[PDB]
Amino acid sequence: TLNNIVSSLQRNGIFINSLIAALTIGGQQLFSSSTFSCPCQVGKNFYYGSAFLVIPALILLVAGFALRSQMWTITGEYCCPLECKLACLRFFSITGRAVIAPLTWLAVTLLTGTYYECAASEFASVDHYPMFDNVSASKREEILAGFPCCRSAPSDVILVRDEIALLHRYQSQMLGWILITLATIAALVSCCVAKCCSPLTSLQHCYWTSHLQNERELFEQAAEQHSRLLMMHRIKKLFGFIPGSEDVKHIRIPSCQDWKDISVPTL
Amino acid sequence: TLNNIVSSLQRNGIFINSLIAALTIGGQQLFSSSTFSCPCQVGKNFYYGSAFLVIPALILLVAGFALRSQMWTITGEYCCPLECKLACLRFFSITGRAVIAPLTWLAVTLLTGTYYECAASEFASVDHYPMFDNVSASKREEILAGFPCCRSAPSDVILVRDEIALLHRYQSQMLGWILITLATIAALVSCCVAKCCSPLTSLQHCYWTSHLQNERELFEQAAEQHSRLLMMHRIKKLFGFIPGSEDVKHIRIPSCQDWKDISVPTL
Amino acid sequence: TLNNIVSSLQRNGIFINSLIAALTIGGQQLFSSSTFSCPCQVGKNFYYGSAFLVIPALILLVAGFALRSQMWTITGEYCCPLECKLACLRFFSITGRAVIAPLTWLAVTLLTGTYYECAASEFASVDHYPMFDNVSASKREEILAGFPCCRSAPSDVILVRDEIALLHRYQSQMLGWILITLATIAALVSCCVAKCCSPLTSLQHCYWTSHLQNERELFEQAAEQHSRLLMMHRIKKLFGFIPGSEDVKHIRIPSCQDWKDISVPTL
Amino acid sequence: TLNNIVSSLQRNGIFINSLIAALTIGGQQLFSSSTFSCPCQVGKNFYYGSAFLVIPALILLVAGFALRSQMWTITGEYCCPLECKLACLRFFSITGRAVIAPLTWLAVTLLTGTYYECAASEFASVDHYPMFDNVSASKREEILAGFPCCRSAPSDVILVRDEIALLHRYQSQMLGWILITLATIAALVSCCVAKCCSPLTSLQHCYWTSHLQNERELFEQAAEQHSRLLMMHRIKKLFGFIPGSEDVKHIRIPSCQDWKDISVPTL
Amino acid sequence: TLNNIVSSLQRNGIFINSLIAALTIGGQQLFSSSTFSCPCQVGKNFYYGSAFLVIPALILLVAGFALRSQMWTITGEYCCPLECKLACLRFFSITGRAVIAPLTWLAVTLLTGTYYECAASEFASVDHYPMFDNVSASKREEILAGFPCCRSAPSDVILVRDEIALLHRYQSQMLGWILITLATIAALVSCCVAKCCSPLTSLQHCYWTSHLQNERELFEQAAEQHSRLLMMHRIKKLFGFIPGSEDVKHIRIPSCQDWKDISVPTL
Amino acid sequence: TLNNIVSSLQRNGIFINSLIAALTIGGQQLFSSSTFSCPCQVGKNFYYGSAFLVIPALILLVAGFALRSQMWTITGEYCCPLECKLACLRFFSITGRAVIAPLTWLAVTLLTGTYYECAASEFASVDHYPMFDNVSASKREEILAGFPCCRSAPSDVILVRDEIALLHRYQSQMLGWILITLATIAALVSCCVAKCCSPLTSLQHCYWTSHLQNERELFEQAAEQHSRLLMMHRIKKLFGFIPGSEDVKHIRIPSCQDWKDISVPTL
Amino acid sequence: TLNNIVSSLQRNGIFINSLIAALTIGGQQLFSSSTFSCPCQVGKNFYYGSAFLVIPALILLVAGFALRSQMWTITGEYCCPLECKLACLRFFSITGRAVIAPLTWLAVTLLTGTYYECAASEFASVDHYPMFDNVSASKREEILAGFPCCRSAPSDVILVRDEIALLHRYQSQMLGWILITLATIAALVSCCVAKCCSPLTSLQHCYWTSHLQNERELFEQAAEQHSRLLMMHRIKKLFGFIPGSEDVKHIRIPSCQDWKDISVPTL
């Protein structure tokens, strides 16, 4: 009764998407808590932020796209009427499966906000503060990059530091919520347009999807069994019996030529 | 005896609604305890409150609506007499399943009250207080946004701060209870009107629901098996045997054209 | 032997009532310990008490009534001689099942007494106290609402505060016990009058209840199987075989019209 | 072998009485330790004691009486020679089962003694004490109600307080033991008179009890099966087949009148 | 193989006596450690001791006697030659089973000695002590009852207190050992006289005991089955079939008179 | 395979003797550690020691003798040539089983030595000590009984106290070892004389023991089955069928006389 | 597969000897750590040491000899050519099994050394020490017995005490190792002489041992079954049937003489 429920869950896309999202959340938390430290330099900070903010998202998106077996077959059919639309729907389903990972990565890394604070701690708009009028531009940048990395100065400095950090946390969380809402709306409208442009009815779609999946599975299994039978026949021609039988009555000792004969696999 | 009870619970809507409510309660608690921090700015506070108060509720409502498979089929039947009423009842059942999540999210986030305090800590009606008469409007806003974010001032300030915070907690909990009562009354009257406008009797309704569910399930399974048989026949035409049989007597080696023949799936 | 005892307990109403009472007790305890805080305002206290005291009880009562499937069928039979009395007995049984939850909620929330103290801490009869003679009415209310919320004053104030709080606890527990006794007496006399007005004998009652339950169950199951057979026949007319059979000899490919034919479910 | 021992224990009245007594002991302990606090008022103390001392006992006795199914049938036979005596013995057995709960509640709540101290802490006979001669009657009551609720005065006061409390504990435990002994003697003499007035011999009694129990059980089961068969026949008249059969050859589609036909249950 | 050993132990009287003794020891320990406190009054002490010392023993003895089913049948045979002696031996066996509980209660409560110290702390023979010569009789009793309840006086008082308490502990343990020895000797001589006056030989006794037990068991079971068959026949006369059969061909609908017919159980 | 080893161990006398010895050791340890306290009186000490030293040993010996079923049959054969010797050997085997418990009790209670110190702490030979010359006889006894009970005096007193206590511990352990050796020698010589006076050979002894045990077991079982058959026949004469049969065709309703007929058990 | 390995281990003498040695080691450790205390007297020390050193060893040796069943049969064959040698080999095997326990007891109690220090702490050769020249002989013994029991004197005394104690520990461990080596050599030479004087070859020995063991086992079992059959036949003569049969057709009621007939067991 186990494998029944296993296959039932494997079919259920909701479980797969939930698992992917949870794994990405946990991985981001561990990654952030382990190997993150602000450079607190004059110009090498924004890059250190944008790297962790962007690069893993793009990488995970490319990984979610390329790791899908059907995508390679579709591209090969495309690389050097109705088929165009069916390929479009297949690509759409694959994209819907793949996009989940980078979106949740971006969402969590913006809602936590610890990357964005270290990302844009230099673009802080400092124009109406009492301590930042006499200082020159260079020392201003020097002391501005300092706040995220560490706090060592008197109370007025730590006050303006907490204010700037809280402002940046607000900006980060607002950007995260905007991204979530815009992305969900885009996904909804994309599913809507996919339903609108579908040349198939509501019932033919189920038959088509089941047909594709079962087609792949059965063709794999049948090709396997066919090659197995062919190799079994070549083995019987070499040695003189079937690998599965028992009490074989004839055992043909191989000659020095038949070894060379079996060297090639007939492609 | 396990799968019996599994299916019995899956049919039972009470269990599904209870699970959804509990999951939303736990998720809201963790979300609030992890990634919430008051901006304590002059104008960027009310938005920070309203975002967490509203946006997740709308998002979860849209998710509960779109994730229902039958809703897509109904909309496709509608998108480009009796059928109208039956579609109305189906939409009603789907809505009844979906609305549970955002309602419980709103309820919990208002009864806890920690979001509402940070949401409307600037609209506090300060007119009869001894320390807020001499201060100008700008510094008044500055010191009013300060109370939710932190407390650093002498005892009179912390006293008025606790009073204002308690007032806002009272307002939040009152709004939450009003929402709960109004929503339950609305749901009750909606179920009443659904019972009133139903053209079917009390017994035909059970037959109709069972018919719809079983219809979907059996059509899926039958289409699957039919496509499986068709692909098995094409495989037998290619290779020369059945993928399930054993001790096949004829093995037809494929030619360079039949591979191109099997390239297309006949749609 | 498991499902035997499962059904035996499910029939046993005592277990269901005990489970409901225990769940309500636990839920009330957690709810009180988590999200309760006295407003300690001048006029917005009694409402804060009465809300938690009353609204959940009414809500749970309505939920226990509407969630009973048979109640909807009875109301539909009533909404637009012997049948009247039988419907009265059915309604009585449903009411007996439903009333348990709000009654135990009220009982526990009065015996704990923490809601009632905060509910009527302003109606405290203060007429023979040494410190409440010189103070004006407004400041009197101000300092009276203060005692439940917090204690910050010298020992005489905390003494009168403890005395008033203990008085209110006594009142709460007395009201709770009166409610318990009156409610049990009412339930007993209602069961007595139900036994008195029953036109059926002692033995016909058992047969009638078993008849109703079994009737509902068998009609559901039979309608399910009938619709299953009908849909199976339509599927055989479409595709050309039975979804359960194996080694089907004829496979009728569907035409572009029969898909439109199967679009309607014949209601 | 499990259900064998389950039924063997269920028959054994000793186990049921032991379980009831243990549950009441635990419930009383928790109830006392959780929601008990002396009013320490001038006149509202004796009632607060007598409530917890008496009301739960009466309530549990009424619950143990009414919850017995056979008692309702006997009363219905009585409500509007040998039968009188047999009904008397049945009532006696039911009373013997029911009385256990309130008796053990009273016993435990008197032996613990914490309720009785707070119950009659005002009737304390204070006539030969050095500090209670000059004080007026009102202040005497005021300071006498104080001792159970709290101790805040010098050592002579706490000495007389401990003496009075110990005296009341002695009185409580003596009353408890007297109640236990008198109640057991009454139960013994009642069983003796039941054995004396029994018109049946020692062996006919066993046959009679087994007859009553088995009669109820078999009549319930048979009425259930009979109604099941009748409803199955009406279902076959409606739809055209048996709900349990498979591969039904005729399926009669229902008409718009037969639905109205099945609306009534023939009572 | 489980139920084999279960019945083998149930037959073994040694296990039952050991279990009873252990349960009484544990119950006495808990009872003493929980609800015991010396009154330390002038005249209300000896009763407080004698109650716990005696009353539970008598109560448990009466309970061990009356709870034995065979004792009721024997008394009924006696209440309004060889039979006299056989009834005497049956009564003897029942008494031997019953006496174990109160004897072990008395033994443990005397060997622990904490009840006896508080029981006779007033009869202490104080005649050769230096501090008890000048004090009057009333104050002498007052200070003598004080020692068991509490110790608050200088070292000479606590010295004489420890001496008196140790003397009383010695007396208690001596009384306990005397009771144990005398009781075992009495039990031995009673078994001896039972063996002497037995008119049956050594082998007939085993047959007689097995006969009595098996007689009771088989008569119970047979009466049960007989009444079951009779009620099944009346049910077949009412409804028209057997409650155990399947695919009953005739179903007789009951009339309004046969319900009244089945109202009486034929006694 | 379990019950095989169970019976194999039950036959093995070594296991039974080991279990008895271990149980007595544990019981003595707990008994000593729980309820032992020196009286430290002038004349009521030696008795307090000798009681715990002797009485439990005698009690356990009598219990080990009387609890043996075969001993009662042998005594009955004796109470009002070869048979004499066989009865002597049976009595010898029973004595060998029984003596183990009191011997190990005495051994452990002497080797631990804590009872003997308190037993003979007054007979201490005090003749060559510096502090015991001036003191009178009465005060000498008073201060001598004091040492075991407590130590409160200066260092010379505690020195002589430790010396006397160590001397008594030495005496106790020496007595224990002498008892062990003498008892084992006596047991060995008794087994030797039993082997010498046996009129049976080495092989007839095994047959005789197996014969006795199997005789008792089979006679018990056969008498049980015989009485069961007889009671079954009387039941068939009363009711008209066999308690084990099913689908009995004749059911004889009993008359008012046959109940009186079955009242007597035919002895 | 369990009982296979159980019997395989039971045959393996190495396991039995290892278990005996381990049990004796653990028992000695517990015994020493629990009930050992130096007398520290003038003449009652050496005996206190020699008792624990010797008596348990002799006792365990006698127990290991007498508890062997075959030893009793051999002695009975001896008590009032080839047989002499075979009896010698049997006695040798029994001795080899038995000697293990006292040898390991002695070994462990000497290697631990705590008994020997207290055994010969008076024979300490004190002739070249600075503090033992002026003191008389009596006080010399007094202060010499003191060192093992306790240390209370200045540093020179504790120095000579540690030196003497270490010397005695060395002596003890040397004696232990000498005992181990001498005993193993003796056991080896005894096995050698047993192999030398054996009149049987290497193969006949295995057959002889297996013959003896199997002989005892089969004769026991056969005598048991034979006596069982004989008693079954006497039971059939008394009652009239077989205790194992079912549905016995004739049941012979016993008469008053046949009970006397069965009173004797025919020896």
Tab-separated table of N, CA, C and O in Angstrom, chain A residues 1 14 82 111-112 163 166-167 169-170 173-174 177 180-181 184 188 191-192 195 203 206-207 210-211 214-215 218-219 221-223 225-226 229-230, chain B residues 31 35 37 39-40 44 48 51-52 55-56 59 66-67 72 76 149 219-220 223-224 226-228 231 234-235 239 241 243 245 251 259 265 267:
chain	number	residue	atom	x	y	z
A	1	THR	N	0.866	-1.170	0.000
A	1	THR	CA	0.000	0.000	0.000
A	1	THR	C	0.914	1.234	0.000
A	1	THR	O	0.508	2.347	-0.346
A	14	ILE	N	1.782	19.571	-6.195
A	14	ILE	CA	1.825	20.443	-5.023
A	14	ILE	C	2.901	19.987	-4.052
A	14	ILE	O	3.641	20.807	-3.495
A	82	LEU	N	-0.118	22.772	-35.373
A	82	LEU	CA	-0.446	22.201	-34.074
A	82	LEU	C	0.793	21.842	-33.268
A	82	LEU	O	0.825	22.058	-32.050
A	111	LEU	N	13.216	39.031	2.237
A	111	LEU	CA	12.454	39.189	3.468
A	111	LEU	C	13.342	39.114	4.698
A	111	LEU	O	13.114	39.832	5.677
A	112	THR	N	14.360	38.254	4.679
A	112	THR	CA	15.321	38.269	5.773
A	112	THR	C	16.068	39.592	5.809
A	112	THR	O	16.330	40.139	6.885
A	163	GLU	N	19.293	53.839	12.626
A	163	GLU	CA	18.264	54.427	11.777
A	163	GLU	C	18.467	54.038	10.316
A	163	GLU	O	17.523	53.620	9.634
A	166	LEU	N	17.665	50.327	9.775
A	166	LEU	CA	16.236	50.058	9.781
A	166	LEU	C	15.584	50.542	8.494
A	166	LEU	O	14.704	49.868	7.945
A	167	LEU	N	16.003	51.707	7.996
A	167	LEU	CA	15.493	52.179	6.714
A	167	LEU	C	15.770	51.158	5.616
A	167	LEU	O	14.893	50.846	4.797
A	169	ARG	N	16.317	47.945	5.940
A	169	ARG	CA	15.497	46.759	6.156
A	169	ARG	C	14.086	46.974	5.634
A	169	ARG	O	13.497	46.079	5.010
A	170	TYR	N	13.527	48.158	5.879
A	170	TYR	CA	12.209	48.474	5.343
A	170	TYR	C	12.204	48.393	3.825
A	170	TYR	O	11.298	47.802	3.223
A	173	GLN	N	12.303	44.660	2.697
A	173	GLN	CA	11.057	43.921	2.857
A	173	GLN	C	9.987	44.415	1.891
A	173	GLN	O	9.192	43.617	1.370
A	174	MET	N	9.968	45.717	1.609
A	174	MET	CA	9.017	46.221	0.628
A	174	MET	C	9.306	45.660	-0.757
A	174	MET	O	8.386	45.236	-1.469
A	177	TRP	N	8.055	42.024	-0.880
A	177	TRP	CA	6.616	41.858	-1.037
A	177	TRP	C	6.161	42.243	-2.438
A	177	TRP	O	5.291	41.580	-3.021
A	180	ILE	N	6.949	39.340	-4.683
A	180	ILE	CA	6.014	38.230	-4.500
A	180	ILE	C	4.701	38.506	-5.220
A	180	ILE	O	4.200	37.670	-5.985
A	181	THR	N	4.127	39.689	-4.996
A	181	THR	CA	2.829	39.994	-5.587
A	181	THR	C	2.906	40.039	-7.106
A	181	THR	O	2.077	39.438	-7.804
A	184	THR	N	3.324	36.460	-8.529
A	184	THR	CA	2.113	35.647	-8.510
A	184	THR	C	1.114	36.130	-9.557
A	184	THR	O	0.461	35.314	-10.218
A	188	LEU	N	-0.333	33.903	-12.626
A	188	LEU	CA	-1.761	33.709	-12.836
A	188	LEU	C	-2.151	34.089	-14.257
A	188	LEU	O	-2.865	33.344	-14.938
A	191	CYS	N	-0.944	31.433	-16.700
A	191	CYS	CA	-1.830	30.276	-16.735
A	191	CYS	C	-3.128	30.606	-17.464
A	191	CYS	O	-3.668	29.772	-18.200
A	192	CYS	N	-3.630	31.829	-17.290
A	192	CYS	CA	-4.848	32.237	-17.984
A	192	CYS	C	-4.643	32.235	-19.493
A	192	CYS	O	-5.481	31.728	-20.245
A	195	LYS	N	-4.509	28.749	-20.805
A	195	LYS	CA	-5.846	28.194	-20.972
A	195	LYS	C	-6.561	28.802	-22.172
A	195	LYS	O	-7.350	28.120	-22.833
A	203	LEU	N	-10.841	18.026	-21.716
A	203	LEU	CA	-10.652	16.597	-21.514
A	203	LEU	C	-9.490	16.038	-22.321
A	203	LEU	O	-8.765	15.164	-21.837
A	206	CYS	N	-5.926	16.067	-20.493
A	206	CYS	CA	-5.546	14.980	-19.599
A	206	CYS	C	-5.032	13.785	-20.388
A	206	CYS	O	-3.984	13.204	-20.064
A	207	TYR	N	-5.763	13.413	-21.439
A	207	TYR	CA	-5.342	12.305	-22.282
A	207	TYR	C	-3.977	12.566	-22.892
A	207	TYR	O	-3.128	11.673	-22.933
A	210	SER	N	-1.136	12.260	-20.094
A	210	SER	CA	-0.931	10.857	-19.764
A	210	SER	C	-0.278	10.117	-20.920
A	210	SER	O	0.586	9.255	-20.709
A	211	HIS	N	-0.644	10.472	-22.150
A	211	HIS	CA	-0.065	9.812	-23.309
A	211	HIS	C	1.426	10.069	-23.385
A	211	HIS	O	2.212	9.145	-23.596
A	214	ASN	N	3.308	8.155	-20.384
A	214	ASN	CA	3.303	6.712	-20.568
A	214	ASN	C	4.111	6.316	-21.794
A	214	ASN	O	4.758	5.263	-21.805
A	215	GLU	N	4.068	7.135	-22.842
A	215	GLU	CA	4.850	6.866	-24.037
A	215	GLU	C	6.323	6.763	-23.695
A	215	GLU	O	6.991	5.784	-24.050
A	218	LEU	N	7.033	3.486	-21.446
A	218	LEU	CA	6.942	2.207	-22.141
A	218	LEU	C	8.014	2.060	-23.204
A	218	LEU	O	8.562	0.969	-23.377
A	219	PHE	N	8.330	3.128	-23.936
A	219	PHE	CA	9.376	2.984	-24.938
A	219	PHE	C	10.715	2.670	-24.299
A	219	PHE	O	11.465	1.824	-24.805
A	221	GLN	N	11.232	1.037	-21.441
A	221	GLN	CA	11.225	-0.344	-20.966
A	221	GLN	C	11.323	-1.334	-22.123
A	221	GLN	O	12.048	-2.338	-22.041
A	222	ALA	N	10.619	-1.058	-23.218
A	222	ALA	CA	10.606	-1.996	-24.330
A	222	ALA	C	11.962	-2.047	-25.008
A	222	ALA	O	12.439	-3.129	-25.367
A	223	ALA	N	12.595	-0.890	-25.208
A	223	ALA	CA	13.927	-0.895	-25.795
A	223	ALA	C	14.896	-1.668	-24.917
A	223	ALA	O	15.740	-2.426	-25.419
A	225	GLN	N	14.203	-4.237	-22.896
A	225	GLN	CA	13.974	-5.674	-23.030
A	225	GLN	C	14.441	-6.193	-24.384
A	225	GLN	O	14.988	-7.299	-24.481
A	226	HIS	N	14.232	-5.412	-25.441
A	226	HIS	CA	14.648	-5.845	-26.769
A	226	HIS	C	16.158	-6.010	-26.840
A	226	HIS	O	16.664	-7.020	-27.345
A	229	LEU	N	17.197	-9.167	-25.039
A	229	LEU	CA	17.015	-10.379	-25.831
A	229	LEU	C	18.093	-10.516	-26.898
A	229	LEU	O	18.620	-11.613	-27.121
A	230	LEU	N	18.442	-9.417	-27.564
A	230	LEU	CA	19.455	-9.512	-28.610
A	230	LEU	C	20.803	-9.931	-28.039
A	230	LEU	O	21.493	-10.795	-28.605
B	31	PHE	N	6.383	33.210	10.960
B	31	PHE	CA	6.687	34.341	10.099
B	31	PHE	C	6.804	35.623	10.905
B	31	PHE	O	7.734	36.411	10.706
B	35	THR	N	10.727	37.390	10.921
B	35	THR	CA	11.091	38.464	10.005
B	35	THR	C	10.228	39.708	10.138
B	35	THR	O	9.770	40.247	9.127
B	37	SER	N	10.070	43.627	11.965
B	37	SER	CA	10.773	44.676	12.700
B	37	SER	C	10.195	46.011	12.269
B	37	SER	O	10.180	46.321	11.074
B	39	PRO	N	9.681	49.717	11.188
B	39	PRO	CA	10.565	50.697	10.545
B	39	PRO	C	10.853	51.889	11.434
B	39	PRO	O	11.951	52.456	11.382
B	40	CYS	N	9.852	52.316	12.206
B	40	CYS	CA	9.938	53.471	13.101
B	40	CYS	C	10.425	54.718	12.363
B	40	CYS	O	11.281	55.464	12.839
B	44	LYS	N	6.995	55.848	6.498
B	44	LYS	CA	7.146	54.510	5.938
B	44	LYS	C	6.801	53.433	6.952
B	44	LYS	O	7.424	52.370	6.987
B	48	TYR	N	4.338	49.539	5.948
B	48	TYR	CA	4.971	48.334	6.466
B	48	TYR	C	3.992	47.495	7.264
B	48	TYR	O	4.120	46.269	7.313
B	51	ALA	N	1.147	46.032	4.622
B	51	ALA	CA	1.649	44.967	3.766
B	51	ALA	C	1.465	43.612	4.428
B	51	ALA	O	0.749	42.745	3.915
B	52	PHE	N	2.064	43.431	5.603
B	52	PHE	CA	1.909	42.173	6.318
B	52	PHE	C	0.462	41.900	6.692
B	52	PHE	O	0.069	40.737	6.827
B	55	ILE	N	-1.472	41.806	2.271
B	55	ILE	CA	-0.961	41.112	1.087
B	55	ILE	C	-0.948	39.596	1.240
B	55	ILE	O	-1.414	38.905	0.322
B	56	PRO	N	-0.445	39.014	2.330
B	56	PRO	CA	-0.510	37.552	2.444
B	56	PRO	C	-1.920	37.006	2.402
B	56	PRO	O	-2.131	35.921	1.850
B	59	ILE	N	-2.947	36.976	-1.235
B	59	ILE	CA	-2.149	35.995	-1.960
B	59	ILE	C	-2.660	34.592	-1.674
B	59	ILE	O	-2.847	33.779	-2.586
B	66	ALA	N	-7.047	29.370	-7.361
B	66	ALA	CA	-6.495	28.869	-8.616
B	66	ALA	C	-6.032	27.422	-8.507
B	66	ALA	O	-6.045	26.696	-9.505
B	67	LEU	N	-5.618	26.982	-7.320
B	67	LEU	CA	-5.097	25.628	-7.178
B	67	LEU	C	-6.173	24.558	-7.273
B	67	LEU	O	-5.839	23.370	-7.256
B	72	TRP	N	-10.705	25.596	-12.890
B	72	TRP	CA	-10.216	25.857	-14.237
B	72	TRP	C	-11.163	25.302	-15.289
B	72	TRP	O	-11.431	25.960	-16.299
B	76	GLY	N	-13.123	27.525	-18.026
B	76	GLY	CA	-13.010	27.214	-19.442
B	76	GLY	C	-14.352	26.971	-20.102
B	76	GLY	O	-14.576	27.378	-21.244
B	149	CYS	N	8.869	51.280	17.991
B	149	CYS	CA	10.194	50.750	17.697
B	149	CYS	C	11.046	50.566	18.948
B	149	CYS	O	11.672	49.514	19.121
B	219	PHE	N	-12.660	8.835	-16.002
B	219	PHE	CA	-12.214	9.264	-17.319
B	219	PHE	C	-10.703	9.383	-17.382
B	219	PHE	O	-10.086	8.980	-18.377
B	220	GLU	N	-10.083	9.920	-16.328
B	220	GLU	CA	-8.625	9.961	-16.303
B	220	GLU	C	-8.043	8.563	-16.464
B	220	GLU	O	-7.198	8.322	-17.339
B	223	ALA	N	-8.603	7.003	-20.021
B	223	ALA	CA	-7.759	7.601	-21.045
B	223	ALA	C	-6.325	7.122	-20.903
B	223	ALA	O	-5.651	6.835	-21.904
B	224	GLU	N	-5.847	7.009	-19.664
B	224	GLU	CA	-4.502	6.488	-19.450
B	224	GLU	C	-4.353	5.095	-20.042
B	224	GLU	O	-3.427	4.830	-20.819
B	226	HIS	N	-6.133	3.546	-22.284
B	226	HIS	CA	-6.293	3.526	-23.732
B	226	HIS	C	-5.015	3.962	-24.428
B	226	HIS	O	-4.558	3.317	-25.382
B	227	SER	N	-4.419	5.062	-23.969
B	227	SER	CA	-3.176	5.493	-24.593
B	227	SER	C	-2.080	4.465	-24.382
B	227	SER	O	-1.226	4.274	-25.257
B	228	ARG	N	-2.095	3.788	-23.236
B	228	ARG	CA	-1.103	2.754	-22.987
B	228	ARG	C	-1.223	1.630	-24.005
B	228	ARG	O	-0.222	1.174	-24.568
B	231	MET	N	0.072	2.859	-27.490
B	231	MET	CA	1.524	2.903	-27.581
B	231	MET	C	2.113	1.500	-27.589
B	231	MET	O	3.105	1.243	-28.280
B	234	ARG	N	1.884	0.314	-31.155
B	234	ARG	CA	2.921	0.882	-32.014
B	234	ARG	C	4.283	0.271	-31.718
B	234	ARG	O	5.088	0.045	-32.631
B	235	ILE	N	4.554	-0.028	-30.449
B	235	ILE	CA	5.813	-0.675	-30.105
B	235	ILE	C	5.883	-2.069	-30.706
B	235	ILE	O	6.934	-2.494	-31.197
B	239	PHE	N	9.124	-3.109	-32.959
B	239	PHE	CA	10.086	-4.133	-32.576
B	239	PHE	C	9.617	-5.538	-32.912
B	239	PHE	O	10.444	-6.387	-33.258
B	241	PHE	N	7.041	-7.387	-30.836
B	241	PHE	CA	6.588	-8.171	-29.696
B	241	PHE	C	5.912	-7.245	-28.692
B	241	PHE	O	5.852	-6.028	-28.878
B	243	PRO	N	5.673	-5.634	-24.901
B	243	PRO	CA	6.583	-5.355	-23.780
B	243	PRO	C	6.342	-6.190	-22.535
B	243	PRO	O	7.250	-6.295	-21.703
B	245	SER	N	5.179	-9.547	-22.532
B	245	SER	CA	5.311	-10.978	-22.750
B	245	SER	C	6.735	-11.453	-22.474
B	245	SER	O	7.683	-10.668	-22.400
B	251	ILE	N	11.790	-11.478	-33.212
B	251	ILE	CA	12.366	-10.194	-32.847
B	251	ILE	C	12.710	-9.493	-34.148
B	251	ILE	O	13.670	-9.873	-34.828
B	259	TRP	N	12.609	4.222	-37.350
B	259	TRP	CA	12.952	5.190	-36.317
B	259	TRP	C	12.363	6.557	-36.636
B	259	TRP	O	11.788	7.214	-35.762
B	265	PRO	N	4.223	11.431	-32.618
B	265	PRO	CA	3.301	10.742	-31.704
B	265	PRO	C	1.846	10.673	-32.149
B	265	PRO	O	1.000	10.298	-31.330
B	267	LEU	N	-0.245	12.798	-32.289
B	267	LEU	CA	-1.025	13.802	-31.568
B	267	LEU	C	-2.177	13.194	-30.774
B	267	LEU	O	-2.052	12.102	-30.219
